[PDB]
Amino acid sequence: VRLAADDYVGFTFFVGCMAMMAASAFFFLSMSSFERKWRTSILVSGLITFIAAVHYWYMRDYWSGFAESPVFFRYVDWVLTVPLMCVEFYLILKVAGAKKSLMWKLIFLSVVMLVTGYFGEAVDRGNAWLWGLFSGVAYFWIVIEIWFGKAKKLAVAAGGDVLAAHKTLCWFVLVGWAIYPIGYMAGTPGWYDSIFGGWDLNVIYNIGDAINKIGFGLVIYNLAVQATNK
Amino acid sequence: VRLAADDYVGFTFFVGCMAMMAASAFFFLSMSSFERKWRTSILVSGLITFIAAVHYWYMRDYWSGFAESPVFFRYVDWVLTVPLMCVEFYLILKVAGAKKSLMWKLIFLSVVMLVTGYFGEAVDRGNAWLWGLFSGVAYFWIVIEIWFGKAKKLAVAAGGDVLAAHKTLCWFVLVGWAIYPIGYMAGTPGWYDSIFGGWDLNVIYNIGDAINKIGFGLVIYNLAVQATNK
Amino acid sequence: VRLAADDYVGFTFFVGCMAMMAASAFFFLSMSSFERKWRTSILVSGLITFIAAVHYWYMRDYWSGFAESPVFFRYVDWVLTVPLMCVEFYLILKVAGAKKSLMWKLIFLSVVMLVTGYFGEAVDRGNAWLWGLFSGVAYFWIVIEIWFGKAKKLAVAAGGDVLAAHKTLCWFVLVGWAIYPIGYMAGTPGWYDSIFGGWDLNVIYNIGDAINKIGFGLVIYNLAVQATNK
Amino acid sequence: VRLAADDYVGFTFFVGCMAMMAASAFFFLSMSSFERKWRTSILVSGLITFIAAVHYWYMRDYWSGFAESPVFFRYVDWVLTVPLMCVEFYLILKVAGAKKSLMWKLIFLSVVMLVTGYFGEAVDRGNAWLWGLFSGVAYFWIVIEIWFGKAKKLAVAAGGDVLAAHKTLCWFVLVGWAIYPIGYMAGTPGWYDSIFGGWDLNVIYNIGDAINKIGFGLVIYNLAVQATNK
Amino acid sequence: VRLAADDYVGFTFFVGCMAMMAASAFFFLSMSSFERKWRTSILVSGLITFIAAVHYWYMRDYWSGFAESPVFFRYVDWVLTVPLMCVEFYLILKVAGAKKSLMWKLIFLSVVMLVTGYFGEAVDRGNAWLWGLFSGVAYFWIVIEIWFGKAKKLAVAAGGDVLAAHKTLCWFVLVGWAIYPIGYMAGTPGWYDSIFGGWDLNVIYNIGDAINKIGFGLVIYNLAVQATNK
Ligand SMILES: CC1=C(/C=C/C(C)=C/C=C/C(C)=C/C=C/C=C(C)/C=C/C=C(C)/C=C/C=C(C)/C=C\[C@H](O)C(C)(C)O)C(C)(C)C[C@H](O)C1
Ligand SMILES: CC1=C(/C=C/C(C)=C/C=C/C(C)=C/C=C/C=C(C)/C=C/C=C(C)/C=C/C=C(C)\C=C/[C@H](O)C(C)(C)O)C(C)(C)C[C@H](O)C1
Ligand SMILES: CC1=C(/C=C/C(C)=C/C=C/C(C)=C/C=C/C=C(C)/C=C/C=C(C)/C=C\C=C(C)/C=C/[C@H](O)C(C)(C)O)C(C)(C)C[C@H](O)C1
Ligand SMILES: CC1=C(/C=C/C(C)=C/C=C/C(C)=C/C=C/C=C(C)/C=C/C=C(C)/C=C\C=C(C)/C=C/[C@H](O)C(C)(C)O)C(C)(C)C[C@H](O)C1
Ligand SMILES: CC1=C(/C=C/C(C)=C/C=C/C(C)=C/C=C/C=C(C)/C=C/C=C(C)/C=C\C=C(C)\C=C/[C@H](O)C(C)(C)O)C(C)(C)C[C@H](O)C1
Ligand SMILES: *C/C=C(C)/C=C/C=C(C)/C=C/C1=C(C)CCCC1(C)C
Ligand SMILES: *C/C=C(C)/C=C/C=C(C)/C=C/C1=C(C)CCCC1(C)C
Ligand SMILES: *C/C=C(C)/C=C/C=C(C)/C=C/C1=C(C)CCCC1(C)C
Ligand SMILES: *C/C=C(C)/C=C/C=C(C)/C=C/C1=C(C)CCCC1(C)C
Ligand SMILES: *C/C=C(C)/C=C/C=C(C)/C=C/C1=C(C)CCCC1(C)C
Ligand SMILES: CCCCCCCCCCCCCCCC
Ligand SMILES: CCCCCCCCCCCCCCCC
Ligand SMILES: CCCCCCCCCCCCCCCC
Ligand SMILES: CCCCCCCCCCCCCCCC
Ligand SMILES: CCCCCCCCCCCCCCCC
Ligand SMILES: CCCCCCCCCCCCCCCC
Ligand SMILES: CCCCCCCCCCCCCCCC
Ligand SMILES: CCCCCCCCCCCCCCCC
Ligand SMILES: CCCCCCCCCCCCCCCC
Ligand SMILES: CCCCCCCCCCCCCCCC
Numbered sequence A, B, C, D, E: 001v002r003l004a005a006d007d008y009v010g011f012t013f014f015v016g017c018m019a020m021m022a023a024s025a026f027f028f029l030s031m032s033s034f035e036r037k038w039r040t041s042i043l044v045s046g047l048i049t050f051i052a053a054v055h056y057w058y059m060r061d062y063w064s065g066f067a068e069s070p071v072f073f074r075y076v077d078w079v080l081t082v083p084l085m086c087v088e089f090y091l092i093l094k095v096a097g098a099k100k101s102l103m104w105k106l107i108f109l110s111v112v113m114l115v116t117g118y119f120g121e122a123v124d125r126g127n128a129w130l131w132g133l134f135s136g137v138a139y140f141w142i143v144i145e146i147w148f149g150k151a152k153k154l155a156v157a158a159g160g161d162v163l164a165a166h167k168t169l170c171w172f173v174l175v176g177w178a179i180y181p182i183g184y185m186a187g188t189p190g191w192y193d194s195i196f197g198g199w200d201l202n203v204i205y206n207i208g209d210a211i212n213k214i215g216f217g218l219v220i221y222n223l224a225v226q227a228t229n230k
């Protein structure tokens, strides 16, 4: 447990843990300065960074001990936080007339995506490409729903700050989340060892997690602020 | 204490701990966005997940050490959380005219159920079937009370969101709680060759606890939300 | 530090710690749903279970390590919580016209009781009967004050919910607190060789503490609720 | 790590830690029941006991390990808490027309007192009497300021609850704080090693800290209560 | 891991950790006593000391173990806190008409400064002078912006308490932050091994961090207080 200056994975575990901890405090402590109608979207942004702060604490210590970070262990957090992130689409479009049907659809797709991903990574690596494909289809459905589907139509109808927030969240989902499917292909045996594979993603995962989770919440927080100051 | 990808019991202890921790924060931090009349029901939903989060933390570490999870140690949480869950029937029917008599009845039955279950599991395994039977009868009385008894009549009279919440809670008690008596029969010596093989009761306990406890609370939280927005 | 199913002392340390922790959260989180005039009585009920939760955490660990629970170590909590419980008589009768004189009397007697008890148990066991007797007399004075003295007269004048609460608290002090003088006589050398056999003092301490501390607070909480509802 | 019944220093570390922890909770959780104008004085009372609770936790564990409590290590808390206590004179006299000049004077004297004391105790024990003397003079100036100086005149002009609180705080500073200079003379080599040298102050420090810190805050809390209730 | 009276680095780690912890509690608990328009600037002052408290806890323990404090490890906190400090210029000038452009500029410069500094210190020490120079230029740009640039013009236009706060913060940036570039030159190989090099900065870092972070926040808190009191 002596620290080394060249351990960049180590460094990014320490930073990521501290940034998520601070983000969780910022969202929980800000909630009361807003009208009740915004509070839930902010609270959930804080839950997302709270789960990640606590799991990053454990992973940071484990890396200090063993100098390993098994990818399957990252799913402890992803299986909870990715559905919560998908629920934020419902929370920000509820005013624009989203119905619980939307919430259930998103929760279902996100959970299928993460559980099939875990089966590919941990339970049945023989059939990792097949599990990948099931995960990939759930991802594609989520992307289609928010870029073109009902969620997009609701955002467009609302216009204003909401539409703006919606569009930014859609970029985070399209571009920010793409690192995870890529690392899956890099780390699992399949037909994609030719292209990817043998790539160290730990630094990318540690920085990506923080940007993905804190960025999502800052966009939601920014929406509450814009709306309130009008 | 390296993590292994095939340790599914391990994985479900880490997930269950994080989900209960997050649920506790969600209910505690939501309480203030509601009129005083709902806050106690929500507070108690948070107490239920808080006790479970803290006990799941200990059990998760113990499994990391010894790769054992003795059933009797789960009763540390059940003896506190199952009575609190039974109290939620009183809290949601208090408006409909439930009297403390109902609260005391439910607390008494739930406590008898859990303590007789612990005597069967830990103190007197020779007579596990007899202790089972006493627990079984307490369970049956609770089920009859909420499906057909006074509590059901109060719910029906109130109608509306309350009746809806009541019925959902009755399904959780009937179907969601059935895993516990089944695991008891699977694990104890008696007249019962409850052979539910292929699945590790530990995985079922870890997933079932989270669903049972967070599900109960989300139904109560949903009732506060429905009522408030009317 | 493997758990054993027959370690009932172990079990009751785990339960007592969790119950106190939950009770502390319940009283601290309830405080704000009450008019200012009730909040202090509730806050102090929470302090009582908070001190006990944290000390039960240490005692639980120590029992896991050494399988010993020295009685003198329980006094770490009792010297703080028993005076706080005695202050609750002042807080609930302040409306009925109790004066700080009463508060100081109760604090003084409770502190004398606990400190003389500790001298008998830990510093001067040669003269345990004498220290016992000094503690005994302080106990008797407290009992006489609340059952017959000024405090009783104030309660009786107030009538209503207050008198009801006062009488229940008087039973907890008379009957619930009797286990402590009994265990003292059971554990110390003197003119008393009280057998009180069959049952492990540690189990009785662990269950008695939780009932004594949470019961006291639930009676104070019940008084605030009754009063608020009218 | 086993506890001994005759370890009175040990016992007083456990009690002191628990009492400061409970006091911190009491002041932080009471703050919201008061008009804004009192909240800062109460918050600072909680900071004082919060710092001490956390440092008492470390010193308690260190004593369990090594059975030593080096006096210089107590200064970790004193260098922060003694200036905060001195600021409380400004906070309670701000209404009576105290100016920031007074705050800065008290902060400066308190910090000089504690830092010169630390130099005498830890960095330059050869000249402990000289450092003593510098600390001694800063103490005397503080005492003169509050008993006779401007601060006293402000209190006297205000009259009422303020004057009462001021006088009680002046007794705590004069008599309650005298233990610290005495222990310095008892523990340092100088011209005073005959009179005071060779005295075990650990029990006195542990009890005195708790009484000094919780006492100061209870006087401030009592001032807020008196003022509010009329 | 016995404590030594001559370990001044050790002492300052313990003090710094406690002071940051106390400052965090002071800012988080004060937030609610202010109109909404000030609360964010105070919350962020608390995040700054919260990150530092938690990182100082880890560094304190590591020094207890190994008696080393690698400079690169301090960047775990600096990469988060220095940008938050720069955002405070935006938060205090938002009323005077600062635009998000200013926020982004400051965040960008602060992050470049800290990341280039870390490259010089940890990844590429061969070219530490060059990385130094890039960091140095980002620093100079920040200084020019706040002393002469747009931010200064906004402050000057606002006048009053804001201008006063602005000027104080500009001194902290100019003089209080200068210790960090100096320590960099003292610790790295370059052309400045003649001027600096061979200097122990640990005591200076530990005291400077506390003064820099708590000082910044006390100036922001002072601005909210002055403004509130009209
Ligand atoms: C240590 C020591 C010493 C100290 C000795 C000490 C302090 C001994 C303390 C003994 C105590 C406290 C015994 C308590 C025994 C409780 C009884 C019998 C209770 C009856 C209760 C009824 C009959 C309720 C009837 C209730 C009714 C009808 C209805 C409603 C009630 O509300 C309820 C809730 C109970 O239903 C000495 C010996 C001095 C010196 C030595 O040298 C050393
Ligand atoms: C790293 C590196 C590089 C860069 C390193 C860098 C940028 C280092 C920067 C160091 C700085 C900026 C030091 C600044 C020192 C300011 C002073 C002393 C100012 C004093 C003022 C006084 C003593 C009185 C003023 C008196 C009054 C009354 C004024 C103010 C008062 O305090 C008050 C607040 C009361 O008004 C380079 C070299 C580029 C490449 C290399 O390769 C490596
Ligand atoms: C895993 C797996 C499977 C599934 C794998 C899956 C789903 C992989 C998915 C990969 C994805 C989604 C890649 C996406 C790449 C998007 C790009 C490069 C876009 C760039 C654009 C940029 C860098 C910026 C800017 C662009 C614009 C327009 C900027 C706009 C501005 O930023 C503003 C916000 C202002 O508009 C399969 C293969 C099925 C089976 C296998 O067996 C296993
Ligand atoms: C321990 C022990 C003892 C005690 C043991 C005990 C009490 C064991 C209890 C086992 C229980 C309660 C099992 C329950 C099984 C319910 C079933 C299969 C029903 C399933 C599923 C339907 C009905 C779905 C759907 C139906 C509909 C209407 C749609 C339902 C949906 O779900 C809806 C959305 C409406 O909710 C004894 C034996 C006494 C002594 C021994 O010595 C040991
Ligand atoms: C460091 C050092 C140095 C200095 C060390 C220093 C300055 C030590 C100073 C110690 C002090 C000032 C001790 C004072 C002791 C006062 C007493 C006991 C007075 C009792 C009076 C009662 C009992 C009446 C009244 C009331 C009481 C107790 C309580 C309450 C009130 O009656 C009330 C009405 C409020 O209840 C020097 C020597 C400079 C160099 C050396 O080389 C080293
Ligand atoms: C906070 C963490 C986040 C946003 C993680 C997101 C992860 C994904 C969207 C993962 C997606 C996957 C697929 C679409 C294909 C292969 C399996 C997964 C789970 C890596
Ligand atoms: C949060 C945990 C929950 C809802 C646990 C519930 C446990 C039961 C309902 C257990 C019931 C039992 C019987 C009715 C028979 C055998 C003994 C028990 C205790 C397992
Ligand atoms: C939460 C803990 C409680 C209520 C403990 C109470 C303890 C006592 C009432 C102890 C009484 C004693 C005597 C009356 C005589 C012997 C010594 C004592 C301290 C056990
Ligand atoms: C919470 C801790 C408190 C109130 C401690 C206060 C300590 C002092 C007032 C110590 C004073 C000293 C001198 C006046 C002379 C010798 C050196 C000191 C630091 C022991
Ligand atoms: C809370 C900690 C603070 C305010 C730290 C600030 C650090 C700097 C302003 C560091 C600046 C540097 C340079 C300008 C050049 C050399 C490298 C750095 C990163 C030390
Ligand atoms: C005071 C308000 C805080 C809001 C919630 C804080 C998040 C806590 C996360 C804990 C992360 C563990 C990191 C500590 C490493 C020792
Ligand atoms: C370890 C890296 C920490 C990174 C934390 C900050 C990430 C911020 C992402 C960008 C948020 C912008 C959304 C604001 C609305 C326009
Ligand atoms: C709403 C959040 C849903 C969270 C889903 C968690 C799934 C837990 C993983 C399942 C692991 C079981 C492995 C069994 C393989 C034989
Ligand atoms: C400031 C808001 C935070 C609220 C946290 C809710 C209580 C959660 C406590 C449960 C902790 C046990 C799990 C920790 C595993 C290391
Ligand atoms: C809400 C009420 C909770 C009740 C908690 C009951 C736990 C009691 C377990 C009893 C253990 C002692 C058995 C010893 C038999 C020899
Ligand atoms: C280890 C598994 C963790 C699983 C997470 C549980 C989420 C809880 C979902 C329960 C169903 C919600 C019903 C609400 C009805 C309005
Ligand atoms: C987070 C909810 C607010 C009030 C919480 C007070 C709980 C008291 C904590 C007691 C901790 C000791 C038990 C933990 C066992 C590991
Ligand atoms: C060893 C664990 C025991 C758990 C104790 C929790 C129950 C508290 C006792 C309840 C007393 C009820 C009196 C309330 C009157 C309104
Ligand atoms: C108002 C609460 C008061 C708490 C009193 C605690 C005192 C602790 C016992 C003192 C131990 C003295 C050591 C014996 C020396 C022979
Ligand atoms: C707002 C009216 C309150 C009257 C307060 C009188 C008694 C206060 C209770 C004392 C609790 C102090 C906690 C000390 C921790 C050991």
Ligand SMILES: CCCCCCCCCCCCCCCC
Pocket (backbone or CB within 6 Å): C054, D017, D021, D024, D025, D028, D029, D050, D053, D054, D057
């Ligand atoms: C609800 C506010 C809580 C008040 C702050 C409590 C201070 C906690 C300091 C830690 C000292 C307790 C010792 C723990 C031993 C394991």
Ligand SMILES: CCCCCCCCCCCCCCCC
Pocket (backbone or CB within 6 Å): D012, D015, D016, D019, D206, D207, D210, D211, D214, D215, D216, D218, D219, D222
């Ligand atoms: C280790 C000993 C524990 C000490 C317990 C703290 C109690 C101190 C309170 C004494 C001061 C009374 C304040 C007067 C209020 C007007």
Ligand SMILES: CCCCCCCCCCCCCCCC
Pocket (backbone or CB within 6 Å): D054, E017, E021, E024, E025, E028, E050, E053, E054, E057
């Ligand atoms: C009541 C609000 C408190 C917020 C501040 C918490 C900061 C905790 C970080 C430092 C942890 C303690 C340091 C040493 C513990 C052994």
Ligand SMILES: CCCCCCCCCCCCCCCC
Pocket (backbone or CB within 6 Å): E012, E015, E016, E019, E206, E207, E210, E211, E214, E215, E216, E218, E219, E222
């Ligand atoms: C080893 C660390 C000790 C540092 C103590 C922290 C307190 C520093 C406060 C700085 C004062 C700034 C005043 C600005 C107020 C307008």
Ligand SMILES: CCCCCCCCCCCC
Pocket (backbone or CB within 6 Å): A168, A171, A172, A175, A176, A179, A204, A207, A208, A211, A212
């Ligand atoms: C609006 C743009 C959002 C895209 C954010 C992507 C961040 C992921 C980077 C992970 C590698 C360091």
Ligand SMILES: CCCCCCCCCCCC
Pocket (backbone or CB within 6 Å): A218, A221, A222, A225, A226, E083, E084, E087, E107
């Ligand atoms: C270090 C801070 C990074 C991101 C800053 C927040 C940007 C948007 C905040 C919303 C303000 C209305």
Ligand SMILES: CCCCCCCCCCCC
Pocket (backbone or CB within 6 Å): B168, B171, B172, B175, B176, B179, B204, B207, B208, B211, B212
């Ligand atoms: C609406 C019906 C709710 C009932 C759900 C039962 C919960 C199932 C427990 C899962 C065991 C793995």
Ligand SMILES: CCCCCCCCCCCC
Pocket (backbone or CB within 6 Å): C168, C171, C172, C175, C176, C179, C204, C207, C208, C211, C212
């Ligand atoms: C309503 C009267 C309550 C007093 C009785 C409580 C005694 C239980 C504590 C001892 C259990 C071992």
Ligand SMILES: CCCCCCCCCCCC
Pocket (backbone or CB within 6 Å): B083, B084, B107, C218, C221, C222, C225, C226
């Ligand atoms: C305020 C209404 C009731 C107060 C008393 C409740 C008693 C609950 C006992 C809980 C045991 C788990």
Ligand SMILES: CCCCCCCCCCCC
Pocket (backbone or CB within 6 Å): D168, D171, D172, D175, D176, D179, D204, D207, D208, D211, D212
């Ligand atoms: C009226 C206030 C006088 C306060 C004096 C208290 C003495 C504290 C030190 C005791 C150490 C055992």
Ligand SMILES: CCCCCCCCCCCC
Pocket (backbone or CB within 6 Å): C080, C083, C084, C107, D218, D221, D222, D225
């Ligand atoms: C152990 C309890 C000590 C409590 C000391 C009394 C507090 C008096 C405060 C008066 C405020 C109304």
Ligand SMILES: CCCCCCCCCCCC
Pocket (backbone or CB within 6 Å): E168, E171, E172, E175, E176, E177, E179, E204, E207, E208, E211, E212
């Ligand atoms: C008016 C503000 C001046 C800033 C003083 C700098 C504080 C840090 C000094 C370094 C500590 C040794």
